[PDB]
Amino acid sequence: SGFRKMAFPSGKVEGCMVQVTCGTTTLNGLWLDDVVYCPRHVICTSEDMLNPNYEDLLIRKSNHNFLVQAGNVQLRVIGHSMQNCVLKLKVDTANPKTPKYKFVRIQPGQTFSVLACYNGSPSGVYQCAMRPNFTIKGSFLNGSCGSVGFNIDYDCVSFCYMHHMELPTGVHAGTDLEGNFYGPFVDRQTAQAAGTDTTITVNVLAWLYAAVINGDRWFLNRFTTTLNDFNLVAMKYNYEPLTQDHVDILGPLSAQTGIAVLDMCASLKELLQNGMNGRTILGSALLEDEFTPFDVVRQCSGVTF
Amino acid sequence: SGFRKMAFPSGKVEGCMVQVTCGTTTLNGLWLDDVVYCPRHVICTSEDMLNPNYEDLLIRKSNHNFLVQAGNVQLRVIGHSMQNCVLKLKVDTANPKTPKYKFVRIQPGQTFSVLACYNGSPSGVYQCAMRPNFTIKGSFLNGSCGSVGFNIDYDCVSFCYMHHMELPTGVHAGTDLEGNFYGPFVDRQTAQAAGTDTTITVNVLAWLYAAVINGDRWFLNRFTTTLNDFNLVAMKYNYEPLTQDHVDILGPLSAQTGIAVLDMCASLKELLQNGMNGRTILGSALLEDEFTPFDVVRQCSGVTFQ
Ligand SMILES: CNC(=O)C1(N2C[C@]3(CCN(c4cncc5ccccc45)C3=O)c3cc(Cl)ccc3C2=O)CC1
Ligand SMILES: CNC(=O)C1(N2C[C@]3(CCN(c4cncc5ccccc45)C3=O)c3cc(Cl)ccc3C2=O)CC1
Numbered sequence: 001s002g003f004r005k006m007a008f009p010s011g012k013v014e015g016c017m018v019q020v021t022c023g024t025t026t027l028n029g030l031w032l033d034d035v036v037y038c039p040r041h042v043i044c045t046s047e048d049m050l051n052p053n054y055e056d057l058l059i060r061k062s063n064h065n066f067l068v069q070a071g072n073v074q075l076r077v078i079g080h081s082m083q084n085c086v087l088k089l090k091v092d093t094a095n096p097k098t099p100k101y102k103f104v105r106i107q108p109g110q111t112f113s114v115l116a117c118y119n120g121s122p123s124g125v126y127q128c129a130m131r132p133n134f135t136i137k138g139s140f141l142n143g144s145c146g147s148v149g150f151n152i153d154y155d156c157v158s159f160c161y162m163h164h165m166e167l168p169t170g171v172h173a174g175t176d177l178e179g180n181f182y183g184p185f186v187d188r189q190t191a192q193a194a195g196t197d198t199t200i201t202v203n204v205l206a207w208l209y210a211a212v213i214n215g216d217r218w219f220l221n222r223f224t225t226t227l228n229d230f231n232l233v234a235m236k237y238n239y240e241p242l243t244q245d246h247v248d249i250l251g252p253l254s255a256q257t258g259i260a261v262l263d264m265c266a267s268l269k270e271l272l273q274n275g276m277n278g279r280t281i282l283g284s285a286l287l288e289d290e291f292t293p294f295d296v297v298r299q300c301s302g303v304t305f
Numbered sequence: 306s307g308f309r310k311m312a313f314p315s316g317k318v319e320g321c322m323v324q325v326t327c328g329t330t331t332l333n334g335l336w337l338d339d340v341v342y343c344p345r346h347v348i349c350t351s352e353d354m355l356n357p358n359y360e361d362l363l364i365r366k367s368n369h370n371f372l373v374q375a376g377n378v379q380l381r382v383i384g385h386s387m388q389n390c391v392l393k394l395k396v397d398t399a400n401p402k403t404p405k406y407k408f409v410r411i412q413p414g415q416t417f418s419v420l421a422c423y424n425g426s427p428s429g430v431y432q433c434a435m436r437p438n439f440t441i442k443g444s445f446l447n448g449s450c451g452s453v454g455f456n457i458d459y460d461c462v463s464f465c466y467m468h469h470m471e472l473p474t475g476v477h478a479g480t481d482l483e484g485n486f487y488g489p490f491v492d493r494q495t496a497q498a499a500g501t502d503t504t505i506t507v508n509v510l511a512w513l514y515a516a517v518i519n520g521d522r523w524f525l526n527r528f529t530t531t532l533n534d535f536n537l538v539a540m541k542y543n544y545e546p547l548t549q550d551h552v553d554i555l556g557p558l559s560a561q562t563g564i565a566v567l568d569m570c571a572s573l574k575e576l577l578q579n580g581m582n583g584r585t586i587l588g589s590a591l592l593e594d595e596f597t598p599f600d601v602v603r604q605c606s607g608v609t610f611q
């Protein structure tokens with residue numbers, strides 16, 4: 001019993017974190033095989049950040065301008081190139097701790113673990129979701145750029161996020177490991193803002209199933225609804241639309257608990273229209289949306305890595 | 306910016322997790338140097354759990370009755386002994402991944418990371434706090450016994466908890482790494498229950514300071530309180546008494562934000578009276594109590610967003 005915001009074990013990722021320094025800028029890099037990946041803004045001064053020409057800034061750098069430190073060992077940079085908003089530094093040593101990995105681009109609503117890092121050293125691990133507005137509600141300070149997000153499947157690490165910046169509302173923006181931003185953001189210090197966000201409906205339903213599995217059933221009722229009527233109510237409360245794919249994905253949970261997905265949608269409609277009336281669900285007074293259906297099944301089954 | 310329930314990176318602990326089996330019973334063990342530590346109830350069948358005589362059960366076992374598996378390698382047990390509610394199995398190989406470590410017994414209110422494990426394999430990591438009633442609100446299934454709790458301040462792992470059982474309310478009980486239970490619990494299937502729990506006042510105050518550091522002050526008020534009048538109110542809401550030690554511990558957060566501890570206590574008294582009126586503090590609609598003053602200093606910026 002119990003239900004916690006749980007991250008994947010971070011060990012396989014800790015063995016890949018290094019420190020990258022270019023002049024006065026020090027940030028984190030990810031060392032896989034003989035390449036270190038890091039945000040391309042490592043080559044920028046504060047003035048360059050106002051309107052950078054990354055190719056022009058990069059041509060003025062030699063391999064020796066990049067100082068890469070893995071623990072207490074200096075790695076020799078033997079090549080450099082840019083891929084979108086990521087800098088790839090070829091080093092003369094393959095990381096002996098390189099795990100089995102893939103680079104994957106995730107969709108809004110998907111969750112992942114973040115290994116927050118400073119000066120190439122891991123400081124903490126926490127669970128995040130890619131918001132519908134393509135930001136993440138992380139916990140990051142200056143020096144955290146280059147920290148990565150990931151999931152694990154069996155023995156394979158799927159890297160999905162690299163940290164680049166913090167927006168004025170204190171939320172975070174970054175790229176996939178191919179340097180493509182999530183959201184309409186750019187790696188420049190120009191006026192940028194998080195758009196209006198929405199709640200991830202399929203995840204709230206998954207968390208209501210987790211509550212039922214754990215014994216919280218007060219919110220259940222005799223009613224059901226249709227997908228169309230439910231989506232009219234979701235649009236009204238700034239919830240994302242629920243699709244037939246989301247209904248199908250929740251199938252196993254509907255079968256285990258005996259509560260149909262549209263039966264749980266009727267519980268969610270009543271919760272939106274009435275509130276909790278002083279009650280809590282899994283120790284929360286808000287409807288939680290950062291657990292996917294897969295996260296709920298995994299935590300309630302004890303899958304190991 | 307931001308404020309999350311943040312665990313320590315689990316790598317140093319993952320490299321210590323092993324599987325321990327005695328007959329049909331299997332659970333997790335912690336392998337440090339040449340010793341594997343695990344709950345002593347690995348020597349019990351379900352039929353032994355009501356009134357187990359651990360000394361009588363253990364004397365009937367040889368070293369070779371204990372099967373220890375580290376990854377896909379079988380370790381050889383060359384000695385065994387019981388210390389309180391833990392079993393210590395001496396093995397013929399020192400763990401090459403043993404980190405720098407210490408065993409620390411913590412007090413209620415303290416937080417730690419848990420590496421949930423099954424069959425010697427890590428499944429996830431999360432933050433926990435030792436409740437005032439000496440239980441932890443973990444997330445554990447059958448097979449999780451032997452999973453540990455720890456902190457990693459300054460590169461040394463401080464192991465503080467080893468998981469033993471789940472109480473009828475779904476909360477968890479366990480021991481320090483010397484096998485001494487936290488709370489009045491025993492490793493028996495006899496009727497046991499968590500006592501009435503309370504909210505960790507010093508941690509709620511630390512989290513209110515985290516919110517001020519992160520740029521929010523909506524909950525503050527023009528009032529102050531004496532420590533005794535604050536305790537008289539807080540106890541009516543089932544909050545733990547705030548001591549002068551807790552006031553002293555909050556000194557650094559008070560200095561960083563410019564809000565005296567007793568002035569933050571007045572804010573907390575008002576929040577307990579009024580609720581949040583549709584507002585949230587650090588993304589929560591409830592007053593959070595599983596962040597210590599030390600955790601706030603660890604995670605938050607050293608510069609308040611004024
Ligand atoms: C809040 N940011 C800032 O004050 C500044 N900034 C800096 C930066 C790099 C570091 N960084 C941060 C990343 N995560 C957390 C943070 C916390 C507190 C300060 C910074 C942080 C950035 O955002 C950056 C990167 C890119 Cl690709 C584009 C623009 C910026 C940027 O605007 C200084 C001006
Ligand atoms: C909830 N517990 C149980 O149903 C039973 N039980 C078993 C056990 C060992 C495993 N275990 C669990 C530990 N964490 C999570 C769990 C989740 C779900 C089942 C069990 C779990 C225990 O509690 C145990 C150990 C000790 Cl030292 C003392 C008593 C017990 C005990 O009562 C079976 C009867």
Ligand SMILES: [Cl-]
Nearest residue numbers: 410411412415
């Ligand atoms: Cl302590």
